[PDB]
Amino acid sequence: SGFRKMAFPSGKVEGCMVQVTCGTTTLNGLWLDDVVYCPRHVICTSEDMLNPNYEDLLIRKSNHNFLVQAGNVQLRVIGHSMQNCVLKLKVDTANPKTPKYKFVRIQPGQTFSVLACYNGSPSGVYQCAMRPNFTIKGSFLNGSCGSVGFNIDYDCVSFCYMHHMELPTGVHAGTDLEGNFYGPFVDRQTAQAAGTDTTITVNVLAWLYAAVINGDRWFLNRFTTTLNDFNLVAMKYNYEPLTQDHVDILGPLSAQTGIAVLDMCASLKELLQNGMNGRTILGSALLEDEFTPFDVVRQCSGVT
Amino acid sequence: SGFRKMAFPSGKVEGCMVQVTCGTTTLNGLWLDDVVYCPRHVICTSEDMLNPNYEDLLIRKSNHNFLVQAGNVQLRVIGHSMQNCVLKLKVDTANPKTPKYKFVRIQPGQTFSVLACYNGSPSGVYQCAMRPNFTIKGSFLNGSCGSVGFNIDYDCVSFCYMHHMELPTGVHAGTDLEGNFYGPFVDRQTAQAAGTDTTITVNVLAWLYAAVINGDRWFLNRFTTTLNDFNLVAMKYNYEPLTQDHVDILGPLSAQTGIAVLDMCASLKELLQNGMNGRTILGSALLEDEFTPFDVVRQCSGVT
Ligand SMILES: CCc1ccncc1NC(=O)Cc1cccc(C(F)(F)F)n1
Ligand SMILES: CCc1ccncc1NC(=O)Cc1cccc(C(F)(F)F)n1
């Protein structure tokens, strides 16, 4: 019993973290096989960041200008290329600690663990969600760029996120491991709008199933609703419209608890319309949307 | 910017997790040097747990009855002894992945990371606090026993917790790495009372400093208070009495923000008396007490 915002064990990712220096800039890199991936803004200076011409800036750089340090050993750089907003530094040594890995582009609403790093050294690990507006509400400071987000399926690490920017609003923006930013964000120090962020309805419902599984049942009621009626309420409270796909994904949790998905929606509808009334659910005074149905099943069944 | 419930990177601890089987029971063990530490209730059966006589039960066991598996290799057990509520299995091989480590007994209110494990395999990592009543609000299932709690100072892992029990109330109880339980709890399947749990006042204040540092300032007000006046309010709301030690520990956060500790106490006093009024602080609708002043400084300064 008990339910926590659990992150994946970070060991497989710590073994890939390197430090990348280019000129005066130092940030983190990801060493997998003979390649170090890092944000391309490592080649920029404080003046450059207003409107950098990355192709022009990268032309002024040679393999020897990229200093890559793994712990305390220096890696020799034999190649450099730009792929979208990431630089790929080919090194002469394959990382002996490379785990089985994939590069995956996650969907908004999906969750992942972040290993925040500074100077190629890991400082902490936390569980995040890619917001519907493609931002992440992380915990990153100057030097954290290059820190990655990932998921783990037994021995395979799926890298999904690389940290690049903090938006003026304090929220975080980054790329997949191919350098494609999530959302409309560009790697420029300019005014950038994160869209309207909605609440991940399927995740909130999954978390209500986790609550019932773990003893918190007060919010359960004698009511039911329809997908259309529920979505009228979701619209008003800036929640993601619930679809039959979402209902189907909640199927295992519905079967485990014996509470029909639309019955759980009616409970959520009443929580949205009436609030918590000073009560808590799983130790929280708000509706938690950073646990997917998969996270709930995994945590409630002890998947290692 | 941003503030998350961040756990330490778990790599150094994953490399120590082994599986310990004894009879029909399987749980986790901690392999450091040539010793595997695990909860002594590994020698028990379902009948035994009502009132086990551990000295008598352990006498029926020999080195060969303790099956220790590290990943997929079997460890040879050349010694076994009981130290309080932990069994120490001497193995013939020192763990090649043993980090620099200490065994420390934490204080109530201090925080730590837990690496939840099943069958000697890590499943997730989360940040916890040792409650004032010596319980932890963890996320553990059957098989999680032997999972450890720890802190990291650069390269040294300080092990502070070993998971042993889930109390009938759904809260978790365990020991230091010498087998001494935190709190009055015993390793018997009996009625066990966790005392009155209070809110860790110094941690809530530290989290209010983290909020101001990270942009959330609405709760700040034109008032001040005294340690005695604040403690009258803390008493009423089951908060830990604030002492001059607590004030002194908040000194670095007070100096960083320029907000006197007693001014922050007045803000907390008003939040206790008036509630949040449907607002949030650092994305939370309640007063968070699982970040110590040290955690706040560490996260806000990027200590690796
Ligand atoms: C406050 C520093 C910080 C904090 C939390 N995450 C990240 C950072 N760092 C940055 O955002 C660096 C930076 C500044 C300007 C422009 C760019 C861009 F090229 F990516 F667009 N990067
Ligand atoms: C529900 C299983 C579980 C879940 C979350 N943490 C732990 C557990 N397991 C146990 O508590 C095992 C157990 C049962 C009875 C008595 C004892 C004791 F000897 F330690 F006292 N241990």
Side-chain angles (χ1 to χ4, degrees), chain A residues 1-12 14 115-116 118 121-129 137-141 166 170 172 280 283-286 290 299-304, chain B residues 1-12 14 115-118 121-129 137-141 166 170 172 280 283-286 290 299-304:
Chain A
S1 172
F3 210 72
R4 281 268 186 197
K5 187 70 72 68
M6 202 179 285
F8 284 100
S10 58
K12 282 151 185 312
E14 297 161 47
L115 179 67
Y118 300 89
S121 284
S123 51
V125 56
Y126 51 87
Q127 190 72 7
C128 286
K137 300 183 179 167
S139 169
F140 297 105
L141 302 178
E166 180 168 88
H172 304 103
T280 72
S284 177
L286 51 83
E290 302 209 333
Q299 188 171 167
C300 298
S301 86
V303 177
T304 69
Chain B
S1 172
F3 210 72
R4 281 268 186 197
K5 187 70 72 68
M6 202 179 285
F8 284 100
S10 58
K12 282 151 185 312
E14 297 161 47
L115 179 67
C117 297
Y118 300 89
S121 284
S123 51
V125 56
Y126 51 87
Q127 190 72 7
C128 286
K137 300 183 179 167
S139 169
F140 297 105
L141 302 178
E166 180 168 88
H172 304 103
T280 72
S284 177
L286 51 83
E290 302 209 333
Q299 188 171 167
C300 298
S301 86
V303 177
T304 69

Coordinates of all heavy atoms in Angstrom, one line a residue, chain A residues 1-12 14 115-116 118 121-129 137-141 166 170 172 280 283-286 290 299-304, chain B residues 1-12 14 115-118 121-129 137-141 166 170 172 280 283-286 290 299-304:
Chain A
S1 N 0.8 -1.2 0.0 CA 0.0 0.0 0.0 C 0.9 1.3 0.0 O 2.1 1.2 0.2 CB -1.0 0.0 1.2 OG -1.7 1.2 1.3
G2 N 0.2 2.4 -0.3 CA 0.9 3.7 -0.4 C 1.1 4.1 -1.8 O 1.2 3.2 -2.7
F3 N 1.1 5.4 -2.1 CA 1.3 5.9 -3.5 C 2.1 7.1 -3.6 O 1.7 8.1 -3.0 CB -0.1 6.1 -4.2 CG -0.1 5.8 -5.6 CD1 0.1 4.5 -6.2 CD2 -0.1 6.9 -6.5 CE1 0.1 4.3 -7.5 CE2 -0.1 6.7 -7.9 CZ 0.0 5.4 -8.4
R4 N 3.2 7.0 -4.2 CA 4.2 8.1 -4.3 C 4.5 8.4 -5.8 O 4.4 7.6 -6.7 CB 5.5 7.6 -3.7 CG 5.5 7.7 -2.2 CD 6.0 9.1 -1.8 NE 6.1 9.2 -0.3 CZ 6.3 10.4 0.3 NH1 6.3 11.5 -0.4 NH2 6.3 10.4 1.6
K5 N 5.0 9.7 -6.0 CA 5.4 10.1 -7.3 C 6.8 9.5 -7.6 O 7.8 10.1 -7.3 CB 5.4 11.7 -7.4 CG 5.7 12.2 -8.8 CD 4.5 12.0 -9.7 CE 3.4 13.0 -9.3 NZ 3.8 14.4 -9.6
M6 N 6.8 8.3 -8.1 CA 7.9 7.5 -8.2 C 8.6 7.7 -9.5 O 8.0 7.5 -10.5 CB 7.5 6.0 -8.0 CG 8.6 5.2 -7.6 SD 7.8 3.5 -7.5 CE 7.0 3.7 -6.0
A7 N 9.9 7.9 -9.4 CA 10.8 7.9 -10.6 C 11.4 6.6 -10.9 O 11.5 5.8 -10.0 CB 11.8 9.0 -10.5
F8 N 11.8 6.3 -12.1 CA 12.6 5.1 -12.5 C 13.9 5.1 -11.8 O 14.5 6.2 -11.6 CB 12.8 5.0 -14.0 CG 11.6 4.6 -14.7 CD1 10.9 5.6 -15.4 CD2 11.2 3.3 -14.8 CE1 9.7 5.2 -16.1 CE2 10.0 3.0 -15.5 CZ 9.3 3.9 -16.1
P9 N 14.5 4.0 -11.5 CA 15.9 3.9 -10.9 C 16.8 4.6 -12.0 O 16.7 4.3 -13.2 CB 16.2 2.5 -10.7 CG 14.8 1.8 -10.6 CD 14.0 2.6 -11.6
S10 N 17.7 5.5 -11.6 CA 18.4 6.3 -12.6 C 19.8 5.8 -12.9 O 20.5 6.5 -13.7 CB 18.6 7.8 -12.1 OG 19.2 7.9 -10.8
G11 N 20.2 4.7 -12.4 CA 21.6 4.2 -12.6 C 22.0 4.0 -14.1 O 23.1 4.5 -14.4
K12 N 21.2 3.4 -14.9 CA 21.5 3.3 -16.3 C 21.7 4.6 -17.0 O 22.6 4.7 -17.9 CB 20.4 2.5 -17.0 CG 20.5 1.0 -16.7 CD 19.2 0.3 -16.8 CE 19.3 -1.2 -16.4 NZ 20.5 -1.9 -17.1
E14 N 22.7 7.6 -15.3 CA 23.9 8.2 -14.7 C 25.2 7.8 -15.4 O 26.1 8.6 -15.6 CB 24.1 7.9 -13.2 CG 23.0 8.4 -12.3 CD 22.9 7.6 -11.0 OE1 24.0 7.5 -10.3 OE2 21.8 7.2 -10.6
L115 N 16.7 13.1 -14.9 CA 17.9 13.0 -14.1 C 18.5 14.4 -14.3 O 19.1 14.6 -15.3 CB 18.8 11.9 -14.5 CG 20.1 11.8 -13.7 CD1 19.9 11.4 -12.2 CD2 21.1 10.8 -14.3
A116 N 18.3 15.3 -13.3 CA 18.9 16.7 -13.4 C 20.4 16.5 -13.1 O 20.8 15.8 -12.2 CB 18.2 17.5 -12.3
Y118 N 24.4 18.7 -13.4 CA 25.2 19.9 -13.5 C 26.7 19.5 -13.7 O 27.2 18.6 -13.0 CB 25.1 20.8 -12.2 CG 23.6 21.2 -12.1 CD1 22.7 20.5 -11.3 CD2 23.1 22.3 -12.8 CE1 21.4 20.8 -11.3 CE2 21.7 22.7 -12.7 CZ 20.9 21.9 -11.9 OH 19.5 22.2 -11.9
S121 N 27.4 15.7 -13.8 CA 27.2 15.0 -12.6 C 25.7 15.0 -12.2 O 25.1 16.1 -12.1 CB 28.0 15.5 -11.5 OG 29.4 15.1 -11.6
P122 N 25.1 13.8 -11.9 CA 23.7 13.8 -11.5 C 23.5 14.4 -10.1 O 24.3 14.1 -9.2 CB 23.4 12.3 -11.6 CG 24.5 11.7 -12.5 CD 25.7 12.5 -12.1
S123 N 22.4 15.2 -10.0 CA 22.1 15.7 -8.7 C 20.8 15.2 -8.1 O 20.7 15.1 -6.9 CB 22.0 17.3 -8.8 OG 21.2 17.7 -9.8
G124 N 19.9 14.8 -9.0 CA 18.6 14.3 -8.5 C 17.7 13.7 -9.6 O 17.9 13.9 -10.8
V125 N 16.7 13.0 -9.2 CA 15.8 12.3 -10.1 C 14.4 12.6 -9.6 O 14.1 12.5 -8.4 CB 16.1 10.8 -10.3 CG1 16.2 10.1 -9.0 CG2 15.2 10.2 -11.3
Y126 N 13.5 12.9 -10.6 CA 12.1 13.2 -10.3 C 11.2 12.7 -11.5 O 11.7 12.7 -12.6 CB 11.8 14.7 -9.9 CG 12.4 15.7 -10.8 CD1 11.6 16.1 -11.9 CD2 13.6 16.2 -10.6 CE1 12.2 17.0 -12.8 CE2 14.2 17.2 -11.5 CZ 13.4 17.6 -12.6 OH 14.0 18.5 -13.5
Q127 N 10.0 12.5 -11.2 CA 9.0 12.0 -12.2 C 8.2 13.3 -12.6 O 7.8 14.1 -11.8 CB 8.0 11.0 -11.5 CG 7.1 10.3 -12.5 CD 7.8 9.4 -13.4 OE1 9.0 9.0 -13.2 NE2 7.1 8.8 -14.3
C128 N 8.1 13.4 -13.9 CA 7.5 14.6 -14.7 C 6.4 14.0 -15.6 O 6.4 12.9 -16.0 CB 8.5 15.3 -15.4 SG 9.6 16.3 -14.4
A129 N 5.6 15.0 -16.2 CA 4.7 14.7 -17.3 C 5.0 15.7 -18.4 O 5.3 16.9 -18.1 CB 3.3 14.8 -16.8
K137 N 7.1 20.9 -16.2 CA 7.2 21.7 -14.9 C 8.3 21.0 -14.2 O 8.1 20.1 -13.4 CB 5.9 21.6 -14.1 CG 4.7 22.2 -14.9 CD 3.4 22.2 -14.0 CE 2.2 22.7 -14.7 NZ 0.9 22.4 -13.9
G138 N 9.5 21.3 -14.6 CA 10.7 20.6 -14.0 C 11.3 21.4 -12.9 O 10.7 22.3 -12.3
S139 N 12.6 21.1 -12.5 CA 13.4 21.8 -11.5 C 14.7 21.8 -12.1 O 15.4 20.8 -12.1 CB 13.4 21.0 -10.2 OG 14.3 21.5 -9.3
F140 N 15.1 22.9 -12.8 CA 16.3 23.0 -13.5 C 16.9 24.4 -13.3 O 16.2 25.4 -13.2 CB 16.1 22.9 -15.0 CG 15.5 21.5 -15.5 CD1 14.2 21.4 -15.9 CD2 16.4 20.5 -15.7 CE1 13.7 20.2 -16.5 CE2 15.9 19.3 -16.2 CZ 14.6 19.2 -16.6
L141 N 18.2 24.5 -13.1 CA 18.9 25.7 -13.0 C 19.9 25.9 -14.2 O 19.9 25.0 -15.0 CB 19.8 25.7 -11.7 CG 19.0 25.4 -10.4 CD1 20.0 25.4 -9.2 CD2 18.0 26.5 -10.1
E166 N 14.6 27.3 -20.2 CA 13.6 27.7 -19.3 C 12.9 28.9 -19.9 O 13.6 29.8 -20.3 CB 14.2 28.1 -17.9 CG 13.1 28.5 -16.9 CD 13.6 28.6 -15.5 OE1 14.0 29.7 -15.1 OE2 13.5 27.6 -14.8
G170 N 9.0 30.4 -16.2 CA 9.5 29.5 -15.3 C 9.2 28.0 -15.6 O 9.6 27.1 -14.8
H172 N 9.6 24.6 -18.4 CA 10.7 24.1 -19.1 C 10.4 23.5 -20.5 O 9.3 23.0 -20.7 CB 11.5 23.1 -18.2 CG 11.9 23.7 -16.9 ND1 11.2 23.5 -15.7 CD2 12.8 24.6 -16.6 CE1 11.8 24.2 -14.8 NE2 12.8 24.9 -15.3
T280 N -8.3 15.5 1.5 CA -7.2 15.1 0.6 C -7.5 13.7 0.0 O -8.3 12.9 0.5 CB -5.9 15.0 1.4 OG1 -5.9 13.9 2.3 CG2 -5.6 16.3 2.2
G283 N -2.9 11.9 0.0 CA -2.1 13.0 0.6 C -2.0 14.3 -0.2 O -1.1 15.1 0.0
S284 N -2.9 14.5 -1.2 CA -2.9 15.7 -2.0 C -4.2 16.4 -1.9 O -5.3 15.9 -2.0 CB -2.6 15.3 -3.5 OG -2.7 16.5 -4.3
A285 N -4.1 17.8 -1.8 CA -5.3 18.6 -1.8 C -5.8 19.1 -3.2 O -6.7 20.0 -3.2 CB -5.2 19.8 -0.8
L286 N -5.3 18.6 -4.2 CA -5.7 18.9 -5.6 C -5.7 17.6 -6.5 O -5.3 16.6 -6.0 CB -4.8 20.0 -6.3 CG -3.3 20.0 -6.2 CD1 -2.8 19.1 -7.4 CD2 -2.7 21.4 -6.4
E290 N -0.2 13.6 -13.0 CA 1.1 13.2 -13.5 C 1.3 11.7 -13.3 O 2.5 11.3 -13.2 CB 2.2 14.1 -13.1 CG 2.0 15.5 -13.5 CD 3.3 16.3 -13.7 OE1 4.3 16.0 -13.1 OE2 3.2 17.3 -14.5
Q299 N 3.0 0.7 -10.4 CA 3.3 1.0 -9.0 C 2.5 0.1 -8.1 O 3.0 -0.4 -7.1 CB 3.1 2.5 -8.7 CG 3.5 2.8 -7.2 CD 3.5 4.3 -6.9 OE1 3.6 4.7 -5.8 NE2 3.4 5.2 -7.9
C300 N 1.2 -0.1 -8.4 CA 0.3 -1.0 -7.6 C 0.6 -2.5 -7.8 O 0.0 -3.3 -7.1 CB -1.2 -0.6 -7.9 SG -1.6 1.1 -7.4
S301 N 1.4 -2.9 -8.8 CA 1.8 -4.3 -9.0 C 3.3 -4.6 -8.7 O 3.7 -5.8 -8.8 CB 1.3 -4.8 -10.3 OG 2.2 -4.6 -11.4
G302 N 4.1 -3.6 -8.5 CA 5.5 -3.8 -8.2 C 6.4 -4.2 -9.4 O 7.3 -5.0 -9.2
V303 N 6.1 -3.6 -10.6 CA 6.9 -3.9 -11.8 C 8.4 -3.4 -11.6 O 8.6 -2.2 -11.5 CB 6.3 -3.4 -13.1 CG1 7.2 -3.7 -14.3 CG2 4.9 -4.1 -13.3
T304 N 9.4 -4.3 -11.7 CA 10.8 -4.0 -11.6 C 11.4 -3.9 -13.0 O 12.6 -3.6 -13.1 CB 11.5 -5.0 -10.7 OG1 11.5 -6.3 -11.3 CG2 10.8 -5.1 -9.3
Chain B
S1 N 15.0 27.6 -12.1 CA 13.7 27.7 -11.4 C 12.9 26.4 -11.5 O 13.3 25.5 -12.2 CB 12.9 28.9 -12.0 OG 11.6 28.9 -11.5
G2 N 11.9 26.3 -10.6 CA 11.0 25.1 -10.5 C 11.4 24.4 -9.2 O 12.6 24.4 -8.8
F3 N 10.5 23.6 -8.6 CA 10.8 22.9 -7.4 C 10.0 21.6 -7.4 O 8.8 21.6 -7.3 CB 10.4 23.8 -6.2 CG 11.3 23.4 -5.0 CD1 12.7 23.8 -5.0 CD2 10.8 22.7 -3.9 CE1 13.5 23.5 -3.9 CE2 11.6 22.4 -2.8 CZ 12.9 22.8 -2.8
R4 N 10.8 20.5 -7.3 CA 10.2 19.2 -7.3 C 10.7 18.3 -6.2 O 11.7 18.6 -5.6 CB 10.7 18.5 -8.6 CG 10.0 18.9 -9.9 CD 8.8 17.9 -10.1 NE 8.1 18.1 -11.3 CZ 6.9 17.7 -11.6 NH1 6.3 16.9 -10.7 NH2 6.3 17.9 -12.7
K5 N 9.9 17.3 -5.8 CA 10.2 16.4 -4.7 C 11.3 15.4 -5.3 O 11.0 14.4 -5.9 CB 9.0 15.6 -4.3 CG 9.2 14.7 -3.0 CD 9.4 15.6 -1.8 CE 8.1 16.2 -1.4 NZ 7.2 15.1 -0.9
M6 N 12.5 15.9 -5.3 CA 13.6 15.2 -5.9 C 14.3 14.2 -5.1 O 14.7 14.5 -3.9 CB 14.6 16.3 -6.3 CG 15.5 16.0 -7.3 SD 16.6 17.4 -7.5 CE 15.5 18.4 -8.4
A7 N 14.5 13.0 -5.6 CA 15.2 12.0 -4.9 C 16.7 12.0 -5.4 O 17.0 12.6 -6.4 CB 14.6 10.7 -5.3
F8 N 17.6 11.4 -4.6 CA 19.0 11.3 -5.0 C 19.1 10.3 -6.2 O 18.3 9.4 -6.2 CB 19.8 10.7 -3.8 CG 20.1 11.7 -2.8 CD1 19.4 11.7 -1.6 CD2 21.1 12.6 -2.9 CE1 19.6 12.6 -0.6 CE2 21.3 13.6 -1.9 CZ 20.6 13.6 -0.8
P9 N 20.1 10.5 -7.0 CA 20.4 9.5 -8.1 C 20.6 8.1 -7.4 O 21.3 8.0 -6.4 CB 21.6 10.0 -8.8 CG 21.7 11.5 -8.4 CD 21.2 11.5 -7.0
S10 N 19.9 7.1 -7.9 CA 19.9 5.8 -7.2 C 20.9 4.8 -7.6 O 20.9 3.7 -7.0 CB 18.5 5.1 -7.2 OG 18.1 4.9 -8.6
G11 N 21.8 5.1 -8.6 CA 22.8 4.2 -9.1 C 23.6 3.4 -8.1 O 23.8 2.2 -8.2
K12 N 24.2 4.2 -7.2 CA 25.1 3.6 -6.2 C 24.4 2.6 -5.3 O 25.0 1.6 -4.9 CB 25.7 4.7 -5.3 CG 26.9 5.4 -6.1 CD 27.1 6.8 -5.6 CE 28.2 7.5 -6.4 NZ 29.4 6.7 -6.5
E14 N 21.4 0.8 -6.4 CA 21.0 -0.3 -7.3 C 22.1 -1.4 -7.3 O 21.8 -2.5 -7.3 CB 20.7 0.2 -8.7 CG 19.5 1.1 -8.8 CD 19.5 1.9 -10.1 OE1 19.7 1.3 -11.2 OE2 19.4 3.1 -10.1
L115 N 14.8 3.4 -2.5 CA 14.8 2.7 -3.7 C 14.0 1.4 -3.5 O 14.4 0.5 -2.8 CB 16.2 2.3 -4.1 CG 16.4 1.5 -5.4 CD1 16.0 2.3 -6.7 CD2 17.8 1.0 -5.6
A116 N 12.7 1.5 -3.9 CA 11.8 0.3 -3.7 C 12.3 -0.8 -4.7 O 12.6 -0.5 -5.8 CB 10.4 0.8 -4.1
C117 N 12.3 -2.0 -4.1 CA 12.8 -3.2 -4.8 C 11.9 -4.4 -4.6 O 11.3 -4.5 -3.6 CB 14.2 -3.5 -4.4 SG 15.5 -2.3 -4.8
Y118 N 11.9 -5.3 -5.6 CA 11.1 -6.6 -5.6 C 12.0 -7.6 -6.2 O 12.6 -7.4 -7.2 CB 9.8 -6.5 -6.3 CG 8.9 -5.4 -5.7 CD1 8.9 -4.1 -6.1 CD2 8.1 -5.7 -4.6 CE1 8.2 -3.1 -5.5 CE2 7.4 -4.7 -3.9 CZ 7.4 -3.4 -4.4 OH 6.7 -2.4 -3.8
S121 N 15.5 -6.5 -7.4 CA 15.5 -5.6 -8.6 C 14.8 -4.3 -8.2 O 13.7 -4.2 -7.8 CB 14.8 -6.3 -9.8 OG 15.6 -7.3 -10.4
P122 N 15.5 -3.2 -8.6 CA 14.9 -1.9 -8.3 C 13.7 -1.5 -9.2 O 13.8 -1.8 -10.4 CB 16.1 -0.9 -8.4 CG 17.3 -1.8 -8.4 CD 16.9 -3.0 -9.1
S123 N 12.7 -1.0 -8.6 CA 11.5 -0.6 -9.4 C 11.3 0.9 -9.5 O 10.8 1.4 -10.5 CB 10.2 -1.3 -8.9 OG 10.1 -1.1 -7.5
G124 N 11.7 1.6 -8.5 CA 11.5 3.1 -8.5 C 12.2 3.8 -7.3 O 12.6 3.1 -6.3
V125 N 12.3 5.1 -7.4 CA 12.9 5.9 -6.4 C 12.1 7.1 -6.1 O 11.5 7.7 -7.0 CB 14.4 6.2 -6.8 CG1 14.5 6.9 -8.2 CG2 15.1 7.0 -5.7
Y126 N 11.9 7.4 -4.8 CA 11.1 8.5 -4.4 C 11.7 9.1 -3.1 O 12.4 8.4 -2.3 CB 9.6 8.2 -4.2 CG 9.4 6.9 -3.3 CD1 9.3 7.0 -1.9 CD2 9.2 5.7 -3.9 CE1 9.1 5.9 -1.1 CE2 9.0 4.6 -3.1 CZ 8.9 4.7 -1.7 OH 8.7 3.6 -1.0
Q127 N 11.4 10.4 -2.9 CA 11.9 11.1 -1.7 C 10.8 11.1 -0.6 O 9.7 11.3 -0.9 CB 12.2 12.6 -2.1 CG 12.9 13.4 -1.1 CD 14.3 13.0 -0.9 OE1 14.9 12.2 -1.6 NE2 15.0 13.6 0.1
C128 N 11.3 10.7 0.6 CA 10.4 10.5 1.8 C 11.0 11.4 3.0 O 12.1 11.8 2.9 CB 10.5 9.0 2.2 SG 9.5 7.9 1.2
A129 N 10.2 11.4 4.0 CA 10.6 12.0 5.3 C 10.3 11.0 6.4 O 9.3 10.3 6.3 CB 9.9 13.3 5.6
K137 N 5.7 7.4 5.0 CA 4.5 7.3 4.2 C 5.1 6.9 2.8 O 5.4 7.8 2.0 CB 3.8 8.7 4.1 CG 3.3 9.2 5.4 CD 2.5 10.5 5.2 CE 1.9 11.1 6.5 NZ 1.5 12.5 6.3
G138 N 5.4 5.6 2.7 CA 6.1 5.1 1.5 C 5.1 4.5 0.5 O 3.9 4.8 0.5
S139 N 5.7 3.8 -0.5 CA 4.9 3.1 -1.5 C 5.6 1.7 -1.5 O 6.7 1.6 -2.2 CB 5.0 3.8 -2.8 OG 4.5 3.0 -3.8
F140 N 5.1 0.8 -0.8 CA 5.7 -0.5 -0.7 C 4.6 -1.6 -0.8 O 3.6 -1.5 -0.2 CB 6.4 -0.7 0.6 CG 7.6 0.2 0.9 CD1 7.4 1.3 1.8 CD2 8.8 0.0 0.4 CE1 8.5 2.1 2.2 CE2 9.9 0.8 0.7 CZ 9.7 1.8 1.6
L141 N 4.9 -2.7 -1.5 CA 4.0 -3.9 -1.6 C 4.7 -5.1 -0.9 O 5.8 -5.0 -0.5 CB 3.8 -4.2 -3.1 CG 3.1 -3.1 -3.9 CD1 3.0 -3.5 -5.3 CD2 1.8 -2.6 -3.3
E166 N 4.5 -3.0 7.0 CA 3.4 -2.1 6.7 C 2.5 -2.3 7.9 O 2.1 -3.4 8.2 CB 2.7 -2.4 5.4 CG 1.6 -1.4 5.2 CD 1.0 -1.4 3.8 OE1 0.1 -2.2 3.5 OE2 1.6 -0.7 2.9
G170 N -1.7 1.3 7.0 CA -1.1 1.6 5.6 C 0.2 2.4 5.6 O 0.6 2.8 4.5
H172 N 4.3 2.9 6.9 CA 5.5 2.0 6.8 C 6.5 2.2 8.0 O 6.7 3.3 8.5 CB 6.1 2.1 5.5 CG 5.2 1.9 4.3 ND1 4.6 2.9 3.6 CD2 4.6 0.7 3.9 CE1 3.8 2.3 2.7 NE2 3.7 1.0 2.9
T280 N -2.6 27.8 -4.7 CA -1.5 26.8 -4.6 C -0.2 27.5 -4.3 O 0.0 28.7 -4.5 CB -1.4 25.9 -5.8 OG1 -0.9 26.7 -6.9 CG2 -2.7 25.3 -6.2
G283 N 2.8 24.5 -6.8 CA 1.9 23.5 -7.4 C 1.2 22.6 -6.4 O 0.7 21.6 -6.7
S284 N 1.2 23.0 -5.1 CA 0.6 22.2 -4.0 C -0.6 23.0 -3.3 O -0.4 24.1 -3.0 CB 1.6 21.7 -3.0 OG 0.9 21.0 -1.9
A285 N -1.7 22.3 -3.0 CA -2.8 22.9 -2.3 C -2.8 22.7 -0.8 O -3.7 23.0 -0.1 CB -4.1 22.5 -2.9
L286 N -1.7 22.2 -0.3 CA -1.5 22.0 1.1 C 0.0 22.4 1.5 O 0.8 22.7 0.7 CB -1.8 20.6 1.7 CG -1.3 19.3 0.9 CD1 0.1 19.0 1.4 CD2 -2.2 18.2 1.2
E290 N 8.0 17.9 3.6 CA 9.0 16.8 3.3 C 10.2 17.4 2.6 O 10.9 16.6 1.9 CB 8.4 15.6 2.6 CG 7.3 14.9 3.5 CD 7.1 13.4 3.3 OE1 7.5 12.9 2.3 OE2 6.7 12.8 4.3
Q299 N 18.7 21.9 -3.8 CA 17.9 22.0 -5.0 C 18.0 23.3 -5.7 O 18.2 23.4 -6.9 CB 16.5 21.5 -4.8 CG 15.7 21.4 -6.0 CD 14.3 20.8 -5.9 OE1 13.5 20.9 -6.8 NE2 14.0 20.2 -4.8
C300 N 17.9 24.4 -4.8 CA 18.0 25.8 -5.4 C 19.4 26.2 -5.7 O 19.6 27.3 -6.3 CB 17.3 26.8 -4.4 SG 15.6 26.5 -4.1
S301 N 20.5 25.4 -5.4 CA 21.9 25.7 -5.8 C 22.5 24.7 -6.8 O 23.7 24.9 -7.2 CB 22.7 26.0 -4.6 OG 23.3 24.9 -4.0
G302 N 21.8 23.6 -7.0 CA 22.3 22.5 -7.9 C 23.4 21.7 -7.5 O 24.3 21.3 -8.3
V303 N 23.4 21.3 -6.2 CA 24.5 20.4 -5.6 C 24.4 19.0 -6.2 O 23.4 18.4 -6.1 CB 24.4 20.4 -4.1 CG1 25.5 19.4 -3.5 CG2 24.6 21.8 -3.5
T304 N 25.5 18.6 -6.8 CA 25.6 17.3 -7.5 C 26.4 16.3 -6.6 O 26.5 15.2 -6.9 CB 26.3 17.4 -8.9 OG1 27.7 17.8 -8.7 CG2 25.6 18.5 -9.7

